[PDB]
Design a protein around this motif. Structure first.
Motif, mmCIF file in Angstrom:
data_model
loop_
_atom_site.group_PDB
_atom_site.id
_atom_site.type_symbol
_atom_site.label_atom_id
_atom_site.label_comp_id
_atom_site.label_asym_id
_atom_site.label_seq_id
_atom_site.Cartn_x
_atom_site.Cartn_y
_atom_site.Cartn_z
ATOM 1 N N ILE A 165 67.907 10.033 34.557
ATOM 2 C CA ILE A 165 67.334 9.821 34.023
ATOM 3 C C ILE A 165 66.886 8.453 35.035
ATOM 4 C CG2 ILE A 165 67.577 10.417 31.671
ATOM 5 C CD1 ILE A 165 68.701 7.314 30.509
ATOM 6 N N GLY A 166 67.814 7.128 35.573
ATOM 7 C CA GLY A 166 67.500 5.887 35.901
ATOM 8 C C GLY A 166 66.752 6.491 37.856
ATOM 9 N N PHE A 167 67.158 7.530 38.177
ATOM 10 C CA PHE A 167 66.194 8.198 39.136
ATOM 11 C C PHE A 167 64.535 6.935 39.727
ATOM 12 C CE2 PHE A 167 63.201 10.027 41.880
ATOM 13 C CZ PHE A 167 63.958 10.218 42.544
ATOM 14 N N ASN A 168 64.266 6.820 38.653
ATOM 15 C CA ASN A 168 62.862 6.270 38.991
ATOM 16 C C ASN A 168 62.608 5.339 38.304
ATOM 17 O OD1 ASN A 168 59.804 5.354 39.180
ATOM 18 N ND2 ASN A 168 59.161 7.027 40.386
ATOM 19 N N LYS A 169 62.806 4.607 37.469
ATOM 20 C CA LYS A 169 62.256 3.893 36.595
ATOM 21 C C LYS A 169 60.642 2.585 36.701
ATOM 22 C CE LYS A 169 67.623 2.100 35.974
ATOM 23 N NZ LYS A 169 68.402 1.098 36.043
ATOM 24 N N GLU A 170 60.075 3.071 37.319
ATOM 25 C CA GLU A 170 58.819 2.535 37.379
ATOM 26 C C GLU A 170 58.257 3.275 36.846
ATOM 27 O OE1 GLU A 170 57.950 -0.905 39.196
ATOM 28 O OE2 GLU A 170 60.440 -0.506 38.802
ATOM 29 N N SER A 171 58.185 4.013 37.282
ATOM 30 C CA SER A 171 57.525 5.702 36.877
ATOM 31 C C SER A 171 57.144 6.030 35.812
ATOM 32 C CB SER A 171 56.521 6.562 37.947
ATOM 33 O OG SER A 171 58.123 6.968 38.194
ATOM 34 N N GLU A 172 58.833 6.820 35.300
ATOM 35 C CA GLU A 172 59.611 7.235 33.972
ATOM 36 C C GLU A 172 60.440 6.225 33.939
ATOM 37 O OE1 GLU A 172 60.443 10.938 36.689
ATOM 38 O OE2 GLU A 172 58.885 11.083 37.180
ATOM 39 N N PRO A 173 60.742 5.981 32.940
ATOM 40 C CA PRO A 173 61.400 4.736 32.202
ATOM 41 C C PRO A 173 61.627 4.935 31.294
ATOM 42 C CG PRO A 173 59.271 3.336 32.402
ATOM 43 C CD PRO A 173 58.846 4.555 32.783
ATOM 44 N N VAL A 174 62.993 5.266 31.469
ATOM 45 C CA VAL A 174 64.433 5.348 30.089
ATOM 46 C C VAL A 174 65.718 4.388 29.420
ATOM 47 C CG1 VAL A 174 64.690 7.687 29.412
ATOM 48 C CG2 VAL A 174 63.859 8.276 30.165
ATOM 49 N N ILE A 175 65.308 4.342 28.413
ATOM 50 C CA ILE A 175 66.758 3.441 28.447
ATOM 51 C C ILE A 175 67.157 4.274 26.941
ATOM 52 C CG2 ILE A 175 66.948 1.171 27.013
ATOM 53 C CD1 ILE A 175 63.494 2.096 27.974
ATOM 54 N N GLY A 217 69.343 0.389 40.386
ATOM 55 C CA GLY A 217 69.281 1.996 40.634
ATOM 56 C C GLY A 217 69.866 2.929 40.418
ATOM 57 N N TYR A 218 69.602 4.132 40.372
ATOM 58 C CA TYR A 218 70.019 5.911 39.782
ATOM 59 C C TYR A 218 71.671 5.480 40.012
ATOM 60 C CZ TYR A 218 70.715 9.123 43.995
ATOM 61 O OH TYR A 218 71.140 9.851 44.800
ATOM 62 N N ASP A 219 72.332 4.962 40.856
ATOM 63 C CA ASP A 219 73.462 5.484 41.636
ATOM 64 C C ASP A 219 74.700 3.404 40.929
ATOM 65 O OD1 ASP A 219 75.288 6.610 42.501
ATOM 66 O OD2 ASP A 219 76.223 5.348 44.209
ATOM 67 N N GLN A 220 73.928 3.491 39.968
ATOM 68 C CA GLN A 220 74.638 1.709 39.749
ATOM 69 C C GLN A 220 74.676 2.280 38.093
ATOM 70 O OE1 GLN A 220 71.030 -0.597 41.849
ATOM 71 N NE2 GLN A 220 72.788 -1.928 41.547
ATOM 72 N N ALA A 221 74.665 3.209 37.606
ATOM 73 C CA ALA A 221 74.426 3.646 36.011
ATOM 74 C C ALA A 221 76.056 3.193 35.405
ATOM 75 C CB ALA A 221 75.155 5.537 36.325
ATOM 76 N N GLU A 222 77.052 3.255 36.023
ATOM 77 C CA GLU A 222 78.292 2.246 35.164
ATOM 78 C C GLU A 222 77.951 0.789 34.835
ATOM 79 O OE1 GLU A 222 78.408 3.948 38.126
ATOM 80 O OE2 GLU A 222 79.850 5.681 37.815
ATOM 81 N N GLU A 223 76.889 0.200 35.894
ATOM 82 C CA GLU A 223 76.626 -1.560 35.849
ATOM 83 C C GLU A 223 75.159 -1.630 34.457
ATOM 84 O OE1 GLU A 223 75.756 -3.650 39.122
ATOM 85 O OE2 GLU A 223 75.195 -5.275 37.949
ATOM 86 N N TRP A 224 74.784 -0.058 34.500
ATOM 87 C CA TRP A 224 73.310 -0.386 33.749
ATOM 88 C C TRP A 224 74.502 -0.011 32.065
ATOM 89 C CZ3 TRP A 224 69.986 4.651 33.524
ATOM 90 C CH2 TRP A 224 69.239 4.025 32.497
ATOM 91 N N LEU A 225 75.031 0.552 31.835
ATOM 92 C CA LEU A 225 75.152 0.870 30.891
ATOM 93 C C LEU A 225 76.277 -0.037 30.283
ATOM 94 C CD1 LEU A 225 76.561 4.641 30.904
ATOM 95 C CD2 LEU A 225 73.651 3.881 30.077
ATOM 96 N N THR A 226 77.276 -0.565 31.150
ATOM 97 C CA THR A 226 77.757 -1.771 30.922
ATOM 98 C C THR A 226 76.837 -2.958 30.629
ATOM 99 O OG1 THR A 226 79.802 -1.340 32.003
ATOM 100 C CG2 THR A 226 78.967 -3.685 31.879
ATOM 101 N N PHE A 227 75.989 -2.768 31.243
ATOM 102 C CA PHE A 227 74.562 -4.135 30.622
ATOM 103 C C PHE A 227 74.634 -4.491 28.925
ATOM 104 C CE2 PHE A 227 70.593 -5.612 30.215
ATOM 105 C CZ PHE A 227 70.699 -6.945 30.537
ATOM 106 N N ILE A 228 74.181 -2.930 28.985
ATOM 107 C CA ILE A 228 73.220 -2.190 27.181
ATOM 108 C C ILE A 228 74.139 -2.394 26.937
ATOM 109 C CG2 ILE A 228 72.266 -0.967 26.104
ATOM 110 C CD1 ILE A 228 70.870 0.793 28.721
#
Length: 186
Positions: free
Chosen positions: A121-131, A170-181
């Motif tokens: 779901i992190g593939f395209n945060k511009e056109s398809e933003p999913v939190i 980007g999509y491949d920064q999923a670990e960092e993203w989920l940590t941030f949330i």
């Protein structure tokens, strides 16, 4: 509102936990109010119990506010099955809605967020933003919003979702993203 939040801990003991999970999430958004339209994609029986009967190909819940919409997708599925069962439909529903040209985000609510799903779901945060939020994070968010008696401003919710989206990652920064949330909420 606290009653609705506490009910999440009873969902798994109902006759159909998926039906009650999406319903309970709808109750949160109905109670927050301040929407132009709120559309639950499920039905209630004559006792007011959720009984599913969703329309295929449509998001679980849509809330339309003045300047933006949130598609809310609820799943009790965990692990790689979260990707297999929800990844495509979450993205597809958002893509379809975005054809309208209206600013929109998907809020995906789960018990736990699978890393492969987050990568998807992190593939395209511009056109398809999913939190993606866990239930514990979502409860924290609602309580932070409402616990001190502040009027619900949908635009504040939009700002928070954009912050949590981390469109810089980007999509491949999923670990960092989920940590941030988690760090921001919990």
């Amino acid at each position: 509102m606290q009653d609705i939040l506490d009910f999440y801990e009873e969902v798994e003991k109902t006759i159909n936990p998926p039906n009650y999970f999406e319903w309970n999430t709808y109750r949160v958004f109905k109670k927050l109010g301040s929407y132009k339209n709120l559309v639950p994609n499920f039905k209630l029986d004559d006792s007011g119990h959720p009984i599913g009967n969703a329309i295929p190909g449509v998001e679980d819940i849509l809330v339309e506010y003045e300047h933006f919409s949130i598609l809310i997708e609820c799943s009790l599925t965990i692990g790689e099955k979260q990707l297999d069962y929800e990844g495509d439909s979450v993205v597809r529903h958002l893509q379809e809605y975005k054809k309208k040209g209206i600013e929109a985000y998907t809020l995906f609510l789960g018990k736990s967020i699978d890393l492969s799903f987050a990568r998807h779901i992190g593939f395209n945060k511009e056109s398809e933003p999913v939190i993606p939020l866990t239930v514990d994070q979502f409860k924290k968010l609602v309580t932070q919003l409402k616990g001190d008696g502040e009027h619900f401003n949908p635009n504040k919710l939009k700002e928070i979702l954009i912050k949590l989206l981390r469109s810089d990652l980007g999509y491949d920064q999923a670990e960092e993203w989920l940590t941030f949330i988690e760090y921001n909420l919990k």
